[PDB]
Design a binder for this molecule. Structure first.
Ligand SMILES: O=C(N[C@@H]1c2ccccc2-c2c(-c3nc4cc(F)ccc4[nH]3)cccc21)c1ccnc2[nH]ccc12
Length: 207
């Protein structure tokens, strides 16, 4: 396990998301499903030129997995996934410029719900989660685990868990007062409101 420091801008954004009073927290799911859909578009598009891109799995889908025992909501996709270089470097560049643009817009009067327009909608996970674990597998790299509870750092290690084939798992370790996002009726309601026309099958698992 390797530990990395967030740049000051992204650390400030994570603190704003955690500390700001903002009741419309449900938008985190729209943001994560949108990132999953974008990752699925990306591998689908690459496969149009190189069909072997799907040797790591033909199914293009999104699964929503609640676990009341662990207090986790997991979003699974069979999209493009992220390499080690994506997790540490490439996405750090995106997070930096996206945060700057979002913070400027927020000071001007934009709302937290508009976070996705800045390419940093992933960080809306911290509206409901005290810790986020990302398990990911990209065709060009090994399976990795990225994780952060904010506090200014994140970790990256090769993941020894169940081999995914290709894609991303976003594990949301929910805050104690955010357990409504583990309830079937609540997740169904949110998906219907914000994500009813996503071009991939979204399966809401139950317990
Ligand atoms: O949401 C994704 N990736 C997000 C993302 C987005 C924007 C900025 C940063 C990050 C990010 C990061 C990340 N943020 C960083 C911020 C830094 F300061 C330095 C390195 C960083 N790495 C780590 C894991 C996952 C993601 C993502 C990508 C592909 N397939 C996916 N399926 C579901 C989500 C998902």
């Amino acid at each position: 396990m390797e530990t990395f420091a967030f740049q000051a801008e992204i650390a400030q954004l994570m603190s704003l998301i955690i500390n700001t009073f903002y009741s419309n927290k449900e938008i985190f799911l729209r943001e994560l499903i949108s990132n999953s859909s974008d990752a699925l578009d990306k591998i689908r598009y690459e496969s149009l030129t190189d069909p072997s891109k799907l040797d790591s799995g033909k199914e293009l889908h999104i699964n929503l997995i609640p676990n009341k025992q662990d207090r986790t909501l997991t979003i699974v996709d069979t999209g493009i996934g992220m390499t080690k270089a994506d997790l540490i470097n490439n996405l750090g560049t995106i997070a930096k410029s996206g945060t700057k643009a979002f913070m400027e817009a927020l000071q001007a009067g934009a709302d937290i719900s508009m976070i996705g327009q800045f390419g940093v909608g992933f960080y809306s996970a911290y509206l409901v989660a005290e810790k986020v674990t990302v398990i990911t597998k990209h065709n060009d790299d090994e399976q990795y685990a990225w994780e952060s509870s904010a506090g200014g750092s994140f970790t990256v290690r090769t993941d020894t868990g169940e081999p995914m084939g290709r894609g991303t798992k976003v594990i949301l370790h929910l805050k104690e007062d955010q357990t409504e996002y583990l309830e079937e009726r609540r997740i169904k309601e949110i998906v219907k409101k914000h994500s009813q026309f996503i071009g991939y099958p979204i399966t809401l698992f139950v317990e």
